[PDB]
Design a protein around this ligand. Structure first.
Ligand SMILES: *[C@@H]1O[C@H](CO)[C@@H](O[C@@H]2O[C@H](CO)[C@@H](O)[C@H](O)[C@H]2NC(C)=O)[C@H](O)[C@H]1NC(C)=O
Ligand SMILES: *[C@@H]1O[C@H](CO)[C@@H](O[C@@H]2O[C@H](CO)[C@@H](O)[C@H](O)[C@H]2NC(C)=O)[C@H](O)[C@H]1NC(C)=O
Ligand SMILES: *[C@@H]1O[C@H](CO)[C@@H](O[C@@H]2O[C@H](CO)[C@@H](O)[C@H](O)[C@H]2NC(C)=O)[C@H](O)[C@H]1NC(C)=O
Ligand SMILES: *[C@@H]1O[C@H](CO)[C@@H](O[C@@H]2O[C@H](CO)[C@@H](O)[C@H](O)[C@H]2NC(C)=O)[C@H](O)[C@H]1NC(C)=O
Ligand SMILES: *[C@@H]1O[C@H](CO)[C@@H](O[C@@H]2O[C@H](CO)[C@@H](O)[C@H](O)[C@H]2NC(C)=O)[C@H](O)[C@H]1NC(C)=O
Ligand SMILES: *[C@@H]1O[C@H](CO)[C@@H](O)[C@H](O)[C@H]1NC(C)=O
Ligand SMILES: *[C@@H]1O[C@H](CO)[C@@H](O)[C@H](O)[C@H]1NC(C)=O
Ligand SMILES: *[C@@H]1O[C@H](CO)[C@@H](O)[C@H](O)[C@H]1NC(C)=O
Ligand SMILES: *[C@@H]1O[C@H](CO)[C@@H](O)[C@H](O)[C@H]1NC(C)=O
Ligand SMILES: *[C@@H]1O[C@H](CO)[C@@H](O)[C@H](O)[C@H]1NC(C)=O
Lengths: 663, 56
């Protein structure tokens, strides 16, 4: 019948006309979420006298007899979603009160009639989302004594009155939602009738001027804490709007997606207690100094793409945001940083300036001046089209911990004078740059570095100097890919002991692991101890030195593929112990045996010896096919991956199907 | 596509080890490099667990 994991009859999509009637008598979640039923009588349900979470969503029930609840006193949550409970009755559920949550969405109930429900002593949450309701009269007397979070999500309500809410005399509401309903009247007295109306959602309704002005009056002397007017058309603002919200102590607000053009002088000055503040996705074109007056309690600010494509942040326009902690200036055309832009932000901790500027071609010393006194732990700075970092451009940043300078156009010859200061640098994301030639002293001013990402950065001066990476001693990651580095000295990676990743992918080192090169093959993976991952791939090493891998003992990934590599030497993996991966996709290996790949296959958990065409001989793959017999190694699928190709005598055969007994 | 679900793994760590936002970046970078290096699984979990143990 249906999948049954522990006590849930997950008859999700099993087109049924009747009830299951043959599942265990102790199921809890009869999740008939699409099964096209029409009736729920009090005969078939006596088998399920223990059902608790009945979900019959997305199904056509047109009638609910009261007797159905008589046989189900253990039900807690029921989701009558997308049903046809159109014609309601006084006793459609009279003594059916042991619920804890209820939904009646997409039922099209035009009228609530007189009093469908009066007891509901444990109805914490109730939803009536997409019915068609045009009022809020649910009962007559004190009622809903435990309804915490009502949801009138999408109705045709056109007003609000105190008498329509008198049934909420002593009802504690946490979050009340009246979104997506066009309202053009708020009759005097609506929310101080409700005992503890705490939250309120008015998203996506056009309130605007001449309506919000009296709305802030009505909410005055009402215990409302949260509020959200997202997409509620607010073209402008002044000092009279939200005046009445001074007495009622609000804590969170939302003006996102309402196309806010200009902010008035003393607007939002009547909000001493606004903690969060959301002005994202707006068309703001000018930000006066006085505009944010009174916002001394705003902690989180969101200005992702409010400053539409030129805006002019005036001088000292943020001096009143003393308690700001997280700025989000992300998708803007802000034209440069003036000398007094971020003045007063002595509580900032996260800046996130990426895709914000269109003029930061160069970073001079007098460019980050305004953040001299500001704490700043993160400085994103991606996609800012930086051409070249001049000297002492970060002298003002001492608390900075992440310098994520990727996705830029930084083409310059580094010298070391661009990092003066930066005593707390933990990350320098320099990926996706044009060209970065180095010197021996290019990193002597940052010995506190931890993650030097240098992918897709043509990196010169890697061999001529002693080592550009000698000063770095606390480096964990050294990413070098897409650079076409074609020469390395025996001291490129020297002294770096706690390095843990050595990514090297689109590199033409194929020439320097030959045998005919002058001086012998380059032994550059020398001395390292904590190299957990060594991703040497897509290079073309058709040879491996006998004892190149001596130092690597705690190595766990030796991903080495896309390499014309063939005929491995002996004792190549003699000393690697914790080798929990060994990837050789697309090589030229023709022979595998106990010295070539033996000691690697001991505690292995992944093997990728996929596309190398071994000679198909009883001696070429014998220990291999007697090793694939018992595989505690979580080998990938052995079908259509291992194939005989070389000898015409037995060409075209998977290794598992090779008759081992013949040899 | 399925390997993206491994983010929930570190998210569990985010709940399991209530550490700084800066350390979350370090965990994400280590996980991304390991996933781009490792083949399938059962080493990401062990490596990320060891990293989280050696990060707090
Ligand atoms: C609810 O019914 C299921 C279905 O029988 C029970 O699951 C079995 O329980 C017995 C003993 O409890 C085990 O030996 C079986 O292996 C279980 N699975 C089966 C038969 O597929 C479950 O225990 C019942 N739970 C309660 C609380 O009565
Ligand atoms: C909210 O309640 C306050 C009382 O704390 C109201 O303030 C009174 O306003 C009237 C005129 O509107 C004055 O005559 C009183 O002197 C005020 N009371 C004071 C100053 O303690 C306020 O009007 C109420 N908000 C409304 C009705 O929107
Ligand atoms: C809100 O801003 C308006 C400006 O639009 C202020 O109106 C001014 O008030 C001063 C002081 O009473 C008077 O010179 C005039 O009434 C207005 N002057 C101008 C140039 O408009 C108003 O005072 C501010 N405050 C309130 C509560 O409305
Ligand atoms: C930022 O860099 C500029 C460019 O070097 C500095 O301007 C120079 O300052 C010195 C010392 O006052 C003068 O002697 C020079 O004449 C200035 N111009 C040039 C072209 O060198 C400026 O002082 C630096 N700002 C800070 C705060 O150090
Ligand atoms: C700096 O900001 C950029 C842009 O938002 C961040 O790059 C995003 O990284 C997430 C990581 O999952 C991706 O899902 C997004 O697609 C990236 N953005 C874009 C536009 O591609 C970057 O991560 C930020 N820096 C730090 C250190 O978090
Ligand atoms: C019941 O089925 C719905 C339909 O997808 C699902 O969203 C819900 O999680 C299920 N409840 C369970 C499995 O407890
Ligand atoms: C109500 O339901 C709960 C759990 O579903 C149960 O513990 C309680 O005994 C029930 N009470 C009545 C009167 O049905
Ligand atoms: C306001 O909304 C936020 C976001 O969901 C929530 O965390 C907070 O608890 C809400 N305020 C109250 C008083 O419930
Ligand atoms: C003022 O804020 C406090 C903070 O909890 C609140 O208890 C009080 O009801 C508020 N005053 C109102 C809403 O008039
Ligand atoms: C007050 O705000 C208005 C906004 O239009 C601005 O024009 C005016 O200069 C401000 N007053 C100041 C800055 O003293």
């Amino acid at each position: 019948k249906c999948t049954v994991s522990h006590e849930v009859a997950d008859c999700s999509h099993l087109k049924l006309t009747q009830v299951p009637d043959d599942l265990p008598t102790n199921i809890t979640v009869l999740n008939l979420t699409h099964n096209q039923l029409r009736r729920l009588p009090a005969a078939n349900f006596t088998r399920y006298s223990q059902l608790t979470s009945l979900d019959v969503g997305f199904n056509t029930i047109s009638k609910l007899e009261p007797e159905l609840c008589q046989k189900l006193p253990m039900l807690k949550v029921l989701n009558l979603q997308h049903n046809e409970l159109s014609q309601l009755s006084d006793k459609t559920f009279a003594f059916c009160t042991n619920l804890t949550e209820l939904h009646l969405m997409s039922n099209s109930i035009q009228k609530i009639k007189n009093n469908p429900f009066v007891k509901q002593k444990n109805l914490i949450t109730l939803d009536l989302s997409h019915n068609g309701l045009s009022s809020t009269k649910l009962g007559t007397q004190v009622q809903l004594e435990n309804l915490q979070e009502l949801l009138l999500s999408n109705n045709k309500i056109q007003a609000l009155k105190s008498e329509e809410l008198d049934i909420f005399a002593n009802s504690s509401l946490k979050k009340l939602e009246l979104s997506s309903n066009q309202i053009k009247e708020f009759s005097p007295g609506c929310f101080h009738a409700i005992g503890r109306l705490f939250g309120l959602f008015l998203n996506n309704v056009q309130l605007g001027p001449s309506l919000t002005e009296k709305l802030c009056l009505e909410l005055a002397n009402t215990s409302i804490r949260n509020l959200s007017l997202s997409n509620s058309q607010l073209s402008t603002t002044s000092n009279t709007t939200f005046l009445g919200l001074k007495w009622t102590n609000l804590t969170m607000l939302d003006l996102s997606y309402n196309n806010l053009n200009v902010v008035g002088n003393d607007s939002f000055a009547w909000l001493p207690q606004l903690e969060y503040f959301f002005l994202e996705y707006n068309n703001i074109q000018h930000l006066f100094s006085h505009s944010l007056h009174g916002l001394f309690n705003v902690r989180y600010l969101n200005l992702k793409r409010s400053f539409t494509k030129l805006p002019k942040i005036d001088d000292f326009s943020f001096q009143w945001l003393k308690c700001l902690e997280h700025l989000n200036m992300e998708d803007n055309d802000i034209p440069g940083i003036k000398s007094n832009m971020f003045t007063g932000l002595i509580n900032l901790k996260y800046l996130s300036l990426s895709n914000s500027f269109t003029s930061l071609r160069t970073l001079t010393n007098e460019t980050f001046v305004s953040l001299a006194h500001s704490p700043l732990h993160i400085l994103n700075l991606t996609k800012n089209k930086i051409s070249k970092i001049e000297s002492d451009a970060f002298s003002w940043l001492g608390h900075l911990e992440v310098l994520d300078l990727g996705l830029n156009e930084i083409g310059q010859e580094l010298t070391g004078q661009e990092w003066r200061g930066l005593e707390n640098i933990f990350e320098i994301y320099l990926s996706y740059n044009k060209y970065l030639q180095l010197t021996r002293n290019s990193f002597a001013l940052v010995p506190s570095l931890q993650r030097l990402m240098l992918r897709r950065v043509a990196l010169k001066n890697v061999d001529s100097s002693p080592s550009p990476f000698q000063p770095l001693r606390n480096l964990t990651i050294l990413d070098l890919s897409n650079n076409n580095i074609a020469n390395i000295n025996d001291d490129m990676l020297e002294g770096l002991e706690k390095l843990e990743i050595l990514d090297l992918q689109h590199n033409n080192l194929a020439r320097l692991w030959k045998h005919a090169n002058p001086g012998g093959p380059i032994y550059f993976l020398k001395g390292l101890s904590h190299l957990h991952i060594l991703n040497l791939e897509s290079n073309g090493f058709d040879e491996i030195p006998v004892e190149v891998f001596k130092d690597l003992f705690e190595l766990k990934i030796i991903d080495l593929g896309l390499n014309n590599l063939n005929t491995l030497p002996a004792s190549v993996f003699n000393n690697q112990v914790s080798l929990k991966s060994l990837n050789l996709q697309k090589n030229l290996i023709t022979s595998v045996e106990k010295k070539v790949f033996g000691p690697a296959f001991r505690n292995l958990t992944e093997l990728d010896m996929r596309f190398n065409p071994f000679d198909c001989t009883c001696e070429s793959i014998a220990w291999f096919v007697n090793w694939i017999n018992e595989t505690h190694t979580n080998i990938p699928e052995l079908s259509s991956h291992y194939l005989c190709n070389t000898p015409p005598h037995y060409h075209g055969f998977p290794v598992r199907l090779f008759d081992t007994s013949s040899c | 596509s399925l390997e993206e679900e491994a983010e929930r793994v570190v998210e569990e760590l985010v709940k399991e080890f209530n550490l700084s936002r800066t350390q979350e970046i370090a965990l994400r970078r280590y996980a991304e490099y390991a996933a781009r290096a490792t083949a399938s699984e059962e080493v990401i979990e062990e490596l990320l667990r060891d990293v989280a143990e050696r990060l707090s």
